[PDB]
Amino acid sequence: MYGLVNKAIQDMISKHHGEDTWEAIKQKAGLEDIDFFVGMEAYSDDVTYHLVGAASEVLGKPAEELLIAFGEYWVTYTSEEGYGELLASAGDSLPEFMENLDNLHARVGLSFPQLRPPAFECQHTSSKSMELHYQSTRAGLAPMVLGLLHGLGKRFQTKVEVTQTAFRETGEDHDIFSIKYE
């Protein structure tokens, strides 16, 4: 993934657990060569997976729990590190944001060819609910998407409940989430 994702993980862990713990996690993951992450440089996905695995071992939390935390963090982090206006342009409510996300990533993709944006499709079931189909070229990030949705509920001051109903990791076509929101 683009370096920005790995910088954001470094930032979350550092802010939350201190530099010592981050350095440890960095070393466990086998990444002490890499001095800083370059935000607009494409990295092998494995660098990301290895950071999450290693942070899981070091902090004593499951990877999927860290992904949820990380998903929430991403929404705030990117707003503060140069994508505040981009996120604003995506809408002023949770459903509109999820509707615009494929288009938001298109705009990211223009400058940055190695972007592999996931696809998000909304089937709105009422004015307070939707089925969300999440289609990704990556495995194992559904819990991050859970975190992301909560990051957005916070951003828009909307209470939101997310329940996954189809699981890509068990060989289903794609993750599907049932969402209820204020």
Ligand SMILES: O=C(O)CCCCN(CCc1cc(F)ccc1OCc1ccc(-c2ccc(C(F)(F)F)cc2)cc1)Cc1ccc(C(=O)O)cc1
């Ligand atoms: O499944 C998957 O593959 C990954 C799913 C999890 C990650 N994705 C979250 C999408 C999301 C979901 C959401 F609900 C809310 C917010 C969200 O973010 C808004 C946002 C999205 C992206 C940038 C940005 C900014 C800059 C750059 C660059 F580095 F300069 F290139 C790159 C991306 C900013 C804001 C972002 C993503 C997607 C693909 C890649 C890549 O392929 O590398 C990297 C990151």
